[PDB]
Amino acid sequence: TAFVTFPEMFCDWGFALGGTTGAQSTGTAHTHTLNTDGLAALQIQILPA
Amino acid sequence: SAISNVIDWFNSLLNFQDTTTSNQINQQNFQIATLASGIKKQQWECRYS
């Protein structure tokens, strides 16, 4: 029994990326291929006193 | 003594009668209230309760 601001499964795990990106900022035009090496999850925020 | 005992038994029966009626009303109202209230959706699942 508990209450959480958002499910703890996100805090414990992540998602594997997939697909293909878009255009680049500069240089030869190309698109990279996504794979399981990319992880989508929550971030970490630093905070001073 | 016989009439006194009958008086006492009738008073006991009336006490049992009122207690049972009050208990029935309380139990039914408690069940109705429990059914009306209960689980509510958390903040993240939806905005409204």
PDB file of C-alpha atoms in Angstrom, chain B residues 7-40:
ATOM      1  CA  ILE B   7     -42.818  -6.892  32.834  1.00  0.00           C
ATOM      2  CA  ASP B   8     -39.076  -7.560  32.983  1.00  0.00           C
ATOM      3  CA  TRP B   9     -39.176  -9.902  29.985  1.00  0.00           C
ATOM      4  CA  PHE B  10     -41.186  -7.406  27.935  1.00  0.00           C
ATOM      5  CA  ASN B  11     -38.707  -4.645  28.774  1.00  0.00           C
ATOM      6  CA  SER B  12     -35.833  -6.919  27.739  1.00  0.00           C
ATOM      7  CA  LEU B  13     -37.602  -7.750  24.474  1.00  0.00           C
ATOM      8  CA  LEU B  14     -38.188  -4.053  23.760  1.00  0.00           C
ATOM      9  CA  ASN B  15     -34.512  -3.316  24.419  1.00  0.00           C
ATOM     10  CA  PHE B  16     -33.513  -6.108  22.039  1.00  0.00           C
ATOM     11  CA  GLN B  17     -36.010  -4.802  19.472  1.00  0.00           C
ATOM     12  CA  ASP B  18     -34.650  -1.257  19.463  1.00  0.00           C
ATOM     13  CA  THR B  19     -31.021  -2.418  19.484  1.00  0.00           C
ATOM     14  CA  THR B  20     -31.631  -4.742  16.531  1.00  0.00           C
ATOM     15  CA  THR B  21     -33.441  -2.060  14.528  1.00  0.00           C
ATOM     16  CA  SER B  22     -30.671   0.467  15.190  1.00  0.00           C
ATOM     17  CA  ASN B  23     -28.019  -2.098  14.253  1.00  0.00           C
ATOM     18  CA  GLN B  24     -29.841  -2.930  11.013  1.00  0.00           C
ATOM     19  CA  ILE B  25     -30.104   0.741  10.049  1.00  0.00           C
ATOM     20  CA  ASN B  26     -26.455   1.366  10.926  1.00  0.00           C
ATOM     21  CA  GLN B  27     -25.215  -1.676   8.995  1.00  0.00           C
ATOM     22  CA  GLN B  28     -27.206  -0.825   5.873  1.00  0.00           C
ATOM     23  CA  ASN B  29     -26.096   2.816   5.960  1.00  0.00           C
ATOM     24  CA  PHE B  30     -22.470   1.777   6.502  1.00  0.00           C
ATOM     25  CA  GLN B  31     -22.595  -0.591   3.534  1.00  0.00           C
ATOM     26  CA  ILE B  32     -24.190   2.073   1.330  1.00  0.00           C
ATOM     27  CA  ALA B  33     -21.540   4.607   2.360  1.00  0.00           C
ATOM     28  CA  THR B  34     -18.719   2.141   1.690  1.00  0.00           C
ATOM     29  CA  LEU B  35     -20.145   1.379  -1.753  1.00  0.00           C
ATOM     30  CA  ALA B  36     -20.514   5.092  -2.523  1.00  0.00           C
ATOM     31  CA  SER B  37     -16.952   5.915  -1.460  1.00  0.00           C
ATOM     32  CA  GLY B  38     -13.801   3.871  -1.998  1.00  0.00           C
ATOM     33  CA  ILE B  39     -10.962   3.760  -4.508  1.00  0.00           C
ATOM     34  CA  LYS B  40     -10.205   6.970  -6.397  1.00  0.00           C
TER      35      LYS B  40
END
